[PDB]
Paper text:
Our motivation in this study has been to explore the effects of a nonpolar substitution of residue 207, which is in closest proximity to the four nitrogen atoms of BV and the ordered pyrrole water found interacting with three of them. In this paper we engineered two DrCBDmon variants containing [name]; DrCBDmon-[name] itself and DrCBDmon-[name]/[name] (WiPhy2). To gain insight into the fluorescent nature of WiPhy2, a 1.3 Å resolution [name] [name] was obtained. There were no significant changes to the overall [name] of WiPhy2 compared to DrCBDmon (RMSD 0.82 Å over all 296 shared Cα atoms including mobile loop regions). The BV chromophore is well-ordered with no evidence of a break in electron density for the cysteine connection to the A-ring. The most obvious result from this new [name] is the confirmation of our hypothesis: waters are less abundant around the L207 side chain than has been seen in other high-resolution structures containing either Asp or His at this position. For [name], within 5 Å of any Leu atom there are only four waters, including the pyrrole water with strong interactions to BV nitrogen atoms in A-, B-, and C-rings. Of course, there are no H-bonds from any of these waters to the L207 side chain in WiPhy2. We demonstrate that WiPhy2 has a fluorescence quantum yield of nearly 9% and an excited state lifetime of 780 ps, both ~20% higher than WiPhy, representing the effect of the Leu on the excited state decay of BV in the binding pocket. Indeed, in WiPhy2 Leu at position 207 raises fluorescence quantum yield and lengthens excited state lifetime, maintaining an illumination wavelength of nearly 700 nm while avoiding PPIXα binding or a narrow pH window for efficacy.
Author numbering: 7 to 133, 138 to 323
Write the structure that this text describes.
Protein backbone atom coordinates (compact mmCIF):
# COMPACT_ATOMS: atom_id res chain seq x y z
CA UNK A 1 0.00 0.00 0.00
CA UNK A 2 1.00 3.61 -0.71
CA UNK A 3 3.08 5.75 1.58
CA UNK A 4 1.48 9.08 2.42
CA UNK A 5 2.74 11.83 0.09
CA UNK A 6 5.72 13.90 1.24
CA UNK A 7 3.58 16.87 2.31
CA UNK A 8 1.64 14.55 4.69
CA UNK A 9 4.88 13.29 6.27
CA UNK A 10 5.36 10.20 4.12
CA UNK A 11 8.88 8.87 3.62
CA UNK A 12 10.99 9.90 0.65
CA UNK A 13 11.34 7.14 -1.88
CA UNK A 14 14.48 5.08 -2.28
CA UNK A 15 15.36 1.99 -4.30
CA UNK A 16 14.14 -0.04 -1.26
CA UNK A 17 10.49 1.04 -1.77
CA UNK A 18 9.93 2.23 -5.36
CA UNK A 19 6.49 0.66 -5.45
CA UNK A 20 5.14 2.64 -2.46
CA UNK A 21 5.40 6.13 -4.00
CA UNK A 22 1.93 7.71 -4.36
CA UNK A 23 2.77 9.06 -7.81
CA UNK A 24 -0.85 10.05 -8.50
CA UNK A 25 -0.88 12.72 -5.74
CA UNK A 26 2.36 14.74 -5.97
CA UNK A 27 0.62 18.03 -5.11
CA UNK A 28 2.47 19.74 -7.93
CA UNK A 29 2.63 20.12 -11.71
CA UNK A 30 5.02 20.60 -14.59
CA UNK A 31 5.72 24.29 -15.37
CA UNK A 32 4.88 24.23 -19.11
CA UNK A 33 1.20 24.61 -18.14
CA UNK A 34 -0.99 25.77 -15.28
CA UNK A 35 -3.59 23.88 -13.29
CA UNK A 36 -6.66 24.90 -11.28
CA UNK A 37 -9.08 22.78 -9.34
CA UNK A 38 -12.66 23.94 -8.88
CA UNK A 39 -15.68 22.78 -6.95
CA UNK A 40 -17.79 20.75 -9.37
CA UNK A 41 -21.09 22.31 -8.20
CA UNK A 42 -20.25 25.95 -7.36
CA UNK A 43 -17.28 26.40 -9.70
CA UNK A 44 -15.29 27.97 -6.83
CA UNK A 45 -11.57 27.87 -7.67
CA UNK A 46 -10.17 25.81 -4.78
CA UNK A 47 -6.52 25.23 -5.74
CA UNK A 48 -4.09 26.80 -8.17
CA UNK A 49 -0.59 25.98 -9.32
CA UNK A 50 1.74 28.74 -8.07
CA UNK A 51 2.52 29.73 -11.69
CA UNK A 52 -1.15 30.34 -12.59
CA UNK A 53 -0.32 34.05 -13.41
CA UNK A 54 2.18 33.08 -16.15
CA UNK A 55 -0.78 31.64 -18.07
CA UNK A 56 -3.95 33.37 -16.76
CA UNK A 57 -2.90 37.00 -16.03
CA UNK A 58 -4.83 37.19 -12.76
CA UNK A 59 -4.12 38.33 -9.22
CA UNK A 60 -3.16 35.21 -7.22
CA UNK A 61 -5.18 36.30 -4.18
CA UNK A 62 -7.99 37.06 -6.62
CA UNK A 63 -7.83 33.73 -8.44
CA UNK A 64 -8.44 31.60 -5.30
CA UNK A 65 -12.12 31.79 -4.32
CA UNK A 66 -13.26 33.23 -7.67
CA UNK A 67 -15.83 31.17 -9.56
CA UNK A 68 -15.44 29.68 -13.03
CA UNK A 69 -18.67 31.58 -13.87
CA UNK A 70 -16.61 34.79 -13.45
CA UNK A 71 -13.22 33.52 -14.76
CA UNK A 72 -14.45 31.51 -17.78
CA UNK A 73 -18.01 32.77 -18.53
CA UNK A 74 -18.21 31.08 -21.97
CA UNK A 75 -16.93 27.67 -20.83
CA UNK A 76 -18.63 27.28 -17.41
CA UNK A 77 -22.11 26.37 -18.81
CA UNK A 78 -20.42 23.97 -21.26
CA UNK A 79 -18.56 22.34 -18.31
CA UNK A 80 -21.76 21.91 -16.28
CA UNK A 81 -23.32 20.10 -19.24
CA UNK A 82 -20.24 18.13 -20.34
CA UNK A 83 -18.88 17.07 -16.94
CA UNK A 84 -21.84 16.94 -14.56
CA UNK A 85 -21.42 15.36 -11.12
CA UNK A 86 -21.43 11.57 -11.42
CA UNK A 87 -20.06 11.50 -14.99
CA UNK A 88 -17.22 9.09 -15.94
CA UNK A 89 -13.66 10.10 -14.93
CA UNK A 90 -12.53 9.26 -18.49
CA UNK A 91 -14.62 12.11 -19.98
CA UNK A 92 -12.63 15.15 -21.12
CA UNK A 93 -13.80 18.64 -22.05
CA UNK A 94 -11.46 20.63 -24.32
CA UNK A 95 -11.65 24.23 -25.48
CA UNK A 96 -9.40 26.90 -26.94
CA UNK A 97 -9.24 30.26 -25.14
CA UNK A 98 -8.48 33.15 -27.54
CA UNK A 99 -8.24 35.97 -24.93
CA UNK A 100 -4.64 35.43 -23.64
CA UNK A 101 -2.14 38.00 -25.01
CA UNK A 102 0.83 35.79 -25.97
CA UNK A 103 -1.26 33.22 -27.86
CA UNK A 104 -4.27 30.92 -27.53
CA UNK A 105 -4.46 28.61 -24.49
CA UNK A 106 -5.72 25.07 -24.75
CA UNK A 107 -8.02 24.12 -21.82
CA UNK A 108 -8.48 20.46 -20.83
CA UNK A 109 -10.91 19.57 -18.04
CA UNK A 110 -11.83 16.32 -16.33
CA UNK A 111 -13.83 15.48 -13.21
CA UNK A 112 -12.66 13.42 -10.25
CA UNK A 113 -15.45 13.03 -7.71
CA UNK A 114 -16.60 16.54 -6.76
CA UNK A 115 -13.58 18.29 -8.26
CA UNK A 116 -13.05 19.75 -11.75
CA UNK A 117 -9.38 19.69 -12.77
CA UNK A 118 -8.53 22.38 -15.33
CA UNK A 119 -5.27 22.25 -17.29
CA UNK A 120 -4.07 25.24 -19.32
CA UNK A 121 -1.31 24.96 -21.94
CA UNK A 122 -0.10 27.18 -24.81
CA UNK A 123 -1.72 26.37 -28.16
CA UNK A 124 0.51 25.18 -30.94
CA UNK A 125 -0.45 24.14 -34.48
CA UNK A 126 0.81 20.70 -35.53
CA UNK A 127 0.72 18.82 -38.85
CA UNK A 128 -5.71 13.01 -42.27
CA UNK A 129 -2.53 12.08 -40.32
CA UNK A 130 -4.49 10.10 -37.69
CA UNK A 131 -6.52 8.17 -40.31
CA UNK A 132 -3.37 7.19 -42.25
CA UNK A 133 -1.53 6.25 -39.03
CA UNK A 134 -4.44 4.03 -37.91
CA UNK A 135 -4.52 2.36 -41.34
CA UNK A 136 -0.75 1.74 -41.10
CA UNK A 137 -1.24 -0.12 -37.79
CA UNK A 138 -4.20 -2.13 -39.13
CA UNK A 139 -2.22 -3.13 -42.24
CA UNK A 140 0.61 -4.77 -40.26
CA UNK A 141 0.20 -8.57 -40.74
CA UNK A 142 1.94 -9.78 -37.57
CA UNK A 143 3.02 -8.55 -34.13
CA UNK A 144 6.65 -7.87 -35.16
CA UNK A 145 5.56 -5.75 -38.13
CA UNK A 146 2.96 -4.01 -35.93
CA UNK A 147 5.65 -3.02 -33.41
CA UNK A 148 7.90 -1.70 -36.19
CA UNK A 149 5.11 0.30 -37.84
CA UNK A 150 3.90 1.68 -34.50
CA UNK A 151 7.32 3.07 -33.58
CA UNK A 152 7.94 4.47 -37.10
CA UNK A 153 4.49 6.07 -37.28
CA UNK A 154 4.74 7.66 -33.83
CA UNK A 155 8.22 8.99 -34.65
CA UNK A 156 6.91 10.48 -37.93
CA UNK A 157 4.01 12.18 -36.13
CA UNK A 158 6.04 13.54 -33.21
CA UNK A 159 9.62 14.07 -34.36
CA UNK A 160 10.87 12.46 -31.12
CA UNK A 161 14.54 11.47 -31.20
CA UNK A 162 13.67 7.93 -30.03
CA UNK A 163 10.44 5.92 -30.08
CA UNK A 164 10.48 2.40 -28.60
CA UNK A 165 8.06 -0.44 -28.04
CA UNK A 166 8.84 -1.45 -24.45
CA UNK A 167 7.34 -4.90 -23.78
CA UNK A 168 6.67 -6.36 -20.32
CA UNK A 169 7.56 -9.98 -19.55
CA UNK A 170 5.51 -12.05 -17.04
CA UNK A 171 8.07 -11.17 -14.29
CA UNK A 172 7.41 -7.46 -15.11
CA UNK A 173 10.93 -6.95 -16.51
CA UNK A 174 10.91 -4.92 -19.71
CA UNK A 175 12.61 -5.13 -23.07
CA UNK A 176 12.89 -2.79 -26.04
CA UNK A 177 11.56 -4.97 -28.90
CA UNK A 178 11.18 -2.32 -31.64
CA UNK A 179 12.56 1.14 -32.18
CA UNK A 180 12.59 4.12 -34.52
CA UNK A 181 15.30 6.68 -33.82
CA UNK A 182 17.26 9.64 -35.09
CA UNK A 183 20.19 9.11 -37.41
CA UNK A 184 23.34 8.07 -35.53
CA UNK A 185 21.78 7.40 -32.10
CA UNK A 186 22.77 4.10 -30.51
CA UNK A 187 20.12 1.37 -30.54
CA UNK A 188 18.26 0.29 -27.40
CA UNK A 189 16.86 -2.77 -29.22
CA UNK A 190 17.24 -5.90 -27.10
CA UNK A 191 18.04 -4.06 -23.88
CA UNK A 192 16.30 -5.54 -20.85
CA UNK A 193 15.55 -3.81 -17.56
CA UNK A 194 14.47 -4.71 -14.02
CA UNK A 195 10.78 -4.58 -13.08
CA UNK A 196 11.48 -1.86 -10.49
CA UNK A 197 12.24 0.73 -13.21
CA UNK A 198 8.49 0.87 -13.93
CA UNK A 199 7.18 -0.22 -10.55
CA UNK A 200 3.87 -1.96 -9.88
CA UNK A 201 1.83 1.09 -8.85
CA UNK A 202 3.02 2.95 -11.97
CA UNK A 203 2.04 -0.01 -14.16
CA UNK A 204 -1.39 -0.09 -12.44
CA UNK A 205 -1.91 3.65 -12.98
CA UNK A 206 -0.90 3.17 -16.62
CA UNK A 207 -3.69 0.61 -17.13
CA UNK A 208 -6.25 3.39 -16.35
CA UNK A 209 -4.54 6.62 -17.46
CA UNK A 210 -3.05 5.88 -20.84
CA UNK A 211 -0.60 8.74 -21.61
CA UNK A 212 1.94 10.53 -19.42
CA UNK A 213 4.98 12.66 -20.02
CA UNK A 214 7.81 14.78 -18.68
CA UNK A 215 8.25 17.76 -21.01
CA UNK A 216 11.48 18.98 -19.39
CA UNK A 217 13.43 16.59 -17.18
CA UNK A 218 15.32 19.46 -15.49
CA UNK A 219 12.24 21.61 -14.73
CA UNK A 220 11.28 21.93 -11.06
CA UNK A 221 7.71 20.98 -10.18
CA UNK A 222 5.30 23.82 -9.35
CA UNK A 223 3.26 23.32 -6.15
CA UNK A 224 -0.52 23.46 -5.95
CA UNK A 225 -1.74 26.01 -3.42
CA UNK A 226 -3.25 24.91 -1.14
CA UNK A 227 -1.73 21.47 -1.69
CA UNK A 228 -4.65 19.69 0.01
CA UNK A 229 -8.12 19.84 -1.52
CA UNK A 230 -10.23 22.12 0.74
CA UNK A 231 -13.23 19.82 0.13
CA UNK A 232 -11.55 16.86 1.82
CA UNK A 233 -8.36 18.00 3.62
CA UNK A 234 -6.87 15.25 1.48
CA UNK A 235 -4.64 14.99 -1.58
CA UNK A 236 -5.89 16.03 -5.01
CA UNK A 237 -6.03 13.08 -7.43
CA UNK A 238 -3.83 13.98 -10.41
CA UNK A 239 -3.54 10.56 -12.12
CA UNK A 240 -5.68 11.87 -15.00
CA UNK A 241 -3.80 15.19 -15.33
CA UNK A 242 -1.08 15.22 -18.00
CA UNK A 243 0.50 18.18 -16.14
CA UNK A 244 0.97 16.05 -12.98
CA UNK A 245 4.53 16.24 -11.67
CA UNK A 246 6.57 13.15 -12.53
CA UNK A 247 8.10 10.97 -9.83
CA UNK A 248 11.50 12.38 -8.83
CA UNK A 249 12.97 8.85 -9.07
CA UNK A 250 11.95 8.71 -12.72
CA UNK A 251 13.05 12.34 -13.40
CA UNK A 252 16.51 11.37 -12.20
CA UNK A 253 16.56 8.16 -14.25
CA UNK A 254 15.70 10.19 -17.35
CA UNK A 255 18.36 12.82 -16.74
CA UNK A 256 20.99 10.10 -16.21
CA UNK A 257 19.90 8.54 -19.52
CA UNK A 258 20.47 11.88 -21.34
CA UNK A 259 16.73 12.38 -21.86
CA UNK A 260 15.33 15.92 -21.89
CA UNK A 261 11.71 14.99 -22.64
CA UNK A 262 9.83 11.71 -22.21
CA UNK A 263 6.37 10.49 -23.16
CA UNK A 264 4.70 7.12 -23.15
CA UNK A 265 1.40 5.64 -24.24
CA UNK A 266 0.02 2.42 -22.76
CA UNK A 267 -0.71 -0.74 -24.69
CA UNK A 268 -3.42 -2.48 -22.64
CA UNK A 269 -4.53 -6.02 -23.53
CA UNK A 270 -7.06 -7.99 -21.46
CA UNK A 271 -6.93 -5.23 -18.82
CA UNK A 272 -3.17 -5.81 -18.34
CA UNK A 273 -0.28 -3.53 -19.29
CA UNK A 274 1.20 -5.30 -22.32
CA UNK A 275 3.77 -2.63 -23.12
CA UNK A 276 4.45 1.03 -23.75
CA UNK A 277 5.15 3.20 -26.74
CA UNK A 278 8.05 4.96 -24.97
CA UNK A 279 9.47 8.16 -26.43
CA UNK A 280 12.53 10.32 -25.71
CA UNK A 281 13.88 13.63 -26.88
CA UNK A 282 17.41 14.72 -25.99
CA UNK A 283 16.22 18.28 -25.24
CA UNK A 284 13.05 19.50 -23.54
CA UNK A 285 10.11 19.20 -25.91
CA UNK A 286 6.46 20.10 -25.35
CA UNK A 287 3.94 18.18 -27.48
CA UNK A 288 0.65 20.12 -27.84
CA UNK A 289 -2.74 18.69 -26.70
CA UNK A 290 -4.13 17.80 -30.16
CA UNK A 291 -1.01 15.75 -30.96
CA UNK A 292 -1.32 14.00 -27.59
CA UNK A 293 -4.96 13.22 -28.47
CA UNK A 294 -3.74 11.66 -31.74
CA UNK A 295 -1.24 9.56 -29.78
CA UNK A 296 -3.97 8.45 -27.33
CA UNK A 297 -6.16 7.31 -30.25
CA UNK A 298 -3.17 5.41 -31.71
CA UNK A 299 -2.46 3.75 -28.35
CA UNK A 300 -6.07 2.52 -28.24
CA UNK A 301 -5.74 1.27 -31.84
CA UNK A 302 -2.42 -0.42 -31.08
CA UNK A 303 -3.99 -2.08 -28.03
CA UNK A 304 -6.95 -3.28 -30.10
CA UNK A 305 -4.61 -4.52 -32.87
CA UNK A 306 -2.34 -6.39 -30.45
CA UNK A 307 -5.47 -7.95 -28.87
CA UNK A 308 -7.01 -8.95 -32.24
CA UNK A 309 -3.68 -10.41 -33.45
CA UNK A 310 -2.94 -12.34 -30.24
CA UNK A 311 -6.51 -13.73 -30.27
CA UNK A 312 -6.19 -14.95 -33.89
CA UNK A 313 -2.84 -16.70 -33.15
C1 LIG B 1 13.06 3.02 -7.26
C2 LIG B 1 12.23 3.68 -8.34
C3 LIG B 1 12.60 3.87 -9.61
C4 LIG B 1 11.73 4.32 -10.71
C5 LIG B 1 10.39 4.44 -10.65
C6 LIG B 1 9.42 4.96 -11.65
N1 LIG B 1 9.45 4.88 -12.97
C7 LIG B 1 8.40 5.46 -13.53
C8 LIG B 1 8.03 5.61 -14.95
C9 LIG B 1 8.72 5.07 -16.16
N2 LIG B 1 9.89 4.43 -16.21
C10 LIG B 1 10.18 4.12 -17.48
C11 LIG B 1 11.42 3.35 -17.82
C12 LIG B 1 12.12 3.35 -18.96
N3 LIG B 1 12.05 4.23 -19.97
C13 LIG B 1 12.96 3.87 -20.90
O1 LIG B 1 13.16 4.46 -21.95
C14 LIG B 1 13.65 2.64 -20.46
C15 LIG B 1 14.70 1.90 -21.17
C16 LIG B 1 15.12 2.19 -22.40
C17 LIG B 1 13.12 2.34 -19.27
C18 LIG B 1 13.46 1.18 -18.36
C19 LIG B 1 9.14 4.55 -18.31
C20 LIG B 1 9.00 4.39 -19.82
C21 LIG B 1 8.22 5.18 -17.46
C22 LIG B 1 6.91 5.79 -17.96
C23 LIG B 1 6.94 7.33 -17.94
C24 LIG B 1 7.54 7.88 -19.21
O2 LIG B 1 7.21 7.36 -20.30
O3 LIG B 1 8.35 8.84 -19.16
C25 LIG B 1 7.63 5.95 -12.56
C26 LIG B 1 6.35 6.73 -12.66
C27 LIG B 1 6.61 8.09 -13.35
C28 LIG B 1 5.39 8.97 -13.33
O4 LIG B 1 4.45 8.71 -14.13
O5 LIG B 1 5.33 9.93 -12.51
C29 LIG B 1 8.30 5.62 -11.32
C30 LIG B 1 7.79 5.98 -9.95
N4 LIG B 1 12.49 4.37 -11.83
C31 LIG B 1 13.71 3.84 -11.62
O6 LIG B 1 14.58 3.77 -12.48
C32 LIG B 1 13.86 3.32 -10.21
C33 LIG B 1 15.13 3.95 -9.59
Amino acid sequence: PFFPPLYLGGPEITTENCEREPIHIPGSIQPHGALLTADGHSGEVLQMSLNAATFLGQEPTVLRGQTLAALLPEQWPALQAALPPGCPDALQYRATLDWPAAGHLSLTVHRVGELLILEFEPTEAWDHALRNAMSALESAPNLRALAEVATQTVRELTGFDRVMLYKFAPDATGEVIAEARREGLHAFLGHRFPASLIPAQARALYTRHLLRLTADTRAAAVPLDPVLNPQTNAPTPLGGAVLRATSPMHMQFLRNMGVGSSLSVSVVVGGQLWGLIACHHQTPYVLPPDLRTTLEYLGRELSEQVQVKEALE
